[PDB]
Amino acid sequence: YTFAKFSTGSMLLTKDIVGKSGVSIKRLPTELQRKFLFDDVYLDKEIEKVTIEARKSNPYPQISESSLLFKDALDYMEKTSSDYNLWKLSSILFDPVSYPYKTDNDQVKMALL
Amino acid sequence: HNELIHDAVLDYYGKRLATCSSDKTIKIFEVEGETHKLIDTLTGHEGPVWRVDWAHPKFGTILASCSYDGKVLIWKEENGRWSQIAVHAVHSASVNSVQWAPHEYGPLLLVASSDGKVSVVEFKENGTTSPIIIDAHAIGVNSASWAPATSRKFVTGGADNLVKIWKYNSDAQTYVLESTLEGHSDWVRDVAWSPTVLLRSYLASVSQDRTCIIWTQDNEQGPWKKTLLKEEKFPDVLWRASWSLSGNVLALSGGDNKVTLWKENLEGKWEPAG
Amino acid sequence: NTEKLYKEVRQRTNALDVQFCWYLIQTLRFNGTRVFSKETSDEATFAFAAQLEFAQLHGHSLFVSCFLNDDKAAEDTIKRLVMREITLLRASTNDHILNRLKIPSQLIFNAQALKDRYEGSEVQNLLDLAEMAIVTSLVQNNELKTLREILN
């Protein structure tokens, strides 16, 4: 016989006759494999990039503006890792380019970009 | 000495664990990572305590346990001293499951005993019990789980291999059965409603015939959809089946000494994870 | 039809992880770069928020949960999590800015009220249960203040 249900703090207790209680406080194996996520600095700087507005159907927060770019994550990864390659290439193809020099008309700008 | 605990429950905030074993005692622990310090032992049953279950802290510290002595015992911590405040044994056999409702419903309890009954015990203004019972299953009820909702409902797993979905009705004042589902060849051990307020609703029904059917209803209308999690019998009889709050992960406690975990993928079918 | 392909890519491979898929969808959304269904963006968002909550990263899961389009779901997810996990979400300033996302005053104190009833507050209540609080209180200045609050 075994028993196991999910915790409020989504994690699992199972029969375990090796502890003291007769159960095991198991930290559920997280699929989330990406180091900088567990460091709270990343999250702070990431909130710095957002504009939160209350909803038009309730007072709960939801994002109105985001300035997140594939670019931004790159500081938190090794330039050698394949991950870094993914995020970089993604930046190159998707993040907006800026062209600082003024251009005669705007279709030109588009061409330069 | 604790060779066979049958159930354990965690509180809303997870600071206080309550295991219950076969020696009739219910031990309360103050958990802290590695160190769960035993804070209490509770002796008041005349048989193995099958299940324990805290209530919503909105109702202070209450814990309804059900044991082999056919009696449901409500307990309560009082200034750091536990006391059996109430009891509800209108069931003529071993009481198996006991699970509180969503706290929006009041302080409702859900008892499910082998006399083919399932009760919903309200606790009135005097704190006294207001039992309104129904007959659930023929040869006995192994489990009964609540449903969240925003038109209340619950599920029951039977000894006649049924899985029933009951709903409240003001006309009847007793929960009127609205839909039954057939798919197991042996005692439906455990049934679970998923707390996912998402596009559809999910039910994981583990059973003795080593199957776990998943009843996914499209919505409020179109009936359920039978889906044998995997199409091979598990190496041994399955016991428990629990959903995760955040995520809709399914945990399966088979009598094969590991707990498996199954997640839904974009096929709609279920895949192991761990 | 990025989305079309994205959906195709989803059912075929796992090369794109939960986090990445969410980040991608969000960037493209908030930069006009591309278009995704409210439902696909919410799907991605749910998945990542959940992974995060499995990692005991409640602040971060909370932040992600806000990119939900469906207001009902956002409400539920957020509420549920804040109330269940208020204690941890009230430590540092990096946790403060958190509860200064725009977590509703109500939700925060309400959650905090629950944590008090369960550990055995009054200003929050001032902002049945009231009778029980009066019960617990059973000085003159406090009584007067309570009276003023009731009048208000």
Side-chain angles (χ1 to χ4, degrees), chain B residues 11-16 54 56-61 103 150 195 197-198 244-249 266-267 271, chain C residues 7 10-11 43 46 49-51 53-54 61 72-73 76 80 83-87 111 114-119:
Chain B
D11 53 319
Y12 198 81
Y13 297 93
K15 235 151 213 280
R16 229 177 302 177
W54 303 85
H56 197 101
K58 177 185 192 169
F59 316 117
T61 297
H103 70 276
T150 312
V197 185
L198 186 273
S244 87
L245 293 155
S246 175
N248 212 59
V249 182
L266 285 81
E267 269 281 340
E271 206 164 341
Chain C
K7 276 188 176 160
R10 234 50 249 284
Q11 307 171 311
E43 190 170 63
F46 276 132
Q51 295 313 330
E53 206 188 288
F54 287 171
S61 157
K72 206 82 176 161
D76 170 45
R80 208 179 38 70
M83 302 203 296
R84 177 190 76 194
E85 292 294 331
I86 17 162
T87 301
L114 189 66
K115 187 76 192 200
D116 302 347
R117 169 111 91 167
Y118 169 88
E119 287 193 354

Side-chain angles (χ1 to χ4, degrees), chain B residues 43-268:
Chain B
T43 292
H45 280 297
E46 294 161 306
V49 191
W50 294 145
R51 283 212 196 177
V52 278
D53 194 36
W54 303 85
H56 197 101
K58 177 185 192 169
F59 316 117
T61 297
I62 293 173
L63 156 56
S65 78
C66 68
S67 173
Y68 182 67
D69 70 311
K71 303 183 188 166
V72 186
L73 270 173
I74 285 78
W75 311 69
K76 160 150 196 159
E77 194 174 54
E78 213 72 88
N79 316 319
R81 302 205 163 193
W82 282 91
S83 42
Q84 299 172 33
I85 285 181
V87 67
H88 185 259
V90 308
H91 297 296
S92 55
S94 172
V95 184
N96 306 285
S97 80
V98 57
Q99 191 197 63
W100 301 96
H103 70 276
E104 295 84 351
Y105 297 170
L108 302 188
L109 191 69
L110 196 66
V111 180
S113 172
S114 315
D115 61 312
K117 285 199 171 176
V118 167
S119 59
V120 182
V121 184
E122 189 144 53
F123 289 75
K124 299 191 195 173
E125 305 196 329
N126 293 20
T128 53
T129 62
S130 180
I132 278 84
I133 310 96
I134 44 161
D135 297 343
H137 283 111
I139 320 182
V141 186
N142 298 163
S143 181
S145 275
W146 271 104
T150 312
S151 37
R152 318 183 167 176
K153 301 179 189 174
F154 58 81
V155 53
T156 53
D160 59 327
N161 313 352
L162 289 177
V163 185
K164 288 183 179 192
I165 302 293
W166 304 74
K167 188 189 184 179
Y168 181 55
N169 221 292
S170 295
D171 294 40
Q173 304 278 36
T174 199
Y175 279 81
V176 182
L177 177 60
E178 193 179 353
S179 271
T180 301
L181 301 169
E182 281 197 40
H184 302 281
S185 66
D186 208 332
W187 282 41
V188 180
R189 280 306 196 179
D190 203 356
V191 285
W193 205 307
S194 185
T196 171
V197 185
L198 186 273
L199 303 187
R200 72 186 63 184
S201 296
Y202 307 84
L203 297 175
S205 60
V206 137
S207 178
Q208 192 98 231
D209 66 318
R210 302 171 243 77
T211 47
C212 174
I213 299 165
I214 300 173
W215 312 95
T216 61
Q217 200 178 26
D218 318 326
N219 62 308
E220 269 202 330
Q221 295 179 7
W224 302 87
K225 297 189 157 170
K226 202 184 197 166
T227 310
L228 295 168
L229 181 75
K230 70 171 180 201
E231 303 194 318
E232 296 131 350
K233 286 161 162 184
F234 295 86
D236 198 52
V237 172
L238 307 182
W239 308 117
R240 292 276 174 77
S242 196
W243 295 105
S244 87
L245 293 155
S246 175
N248 212 59
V249 182
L250 180 58
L252 290 187
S253 301
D256 24 310
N257 289 7
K258 168 68 179 163
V259 192
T260 56
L261 298 159
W262 304 82
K263 49 178 186 188
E264 184 181 45
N265 58 43
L266 285 81
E267 269 281 340

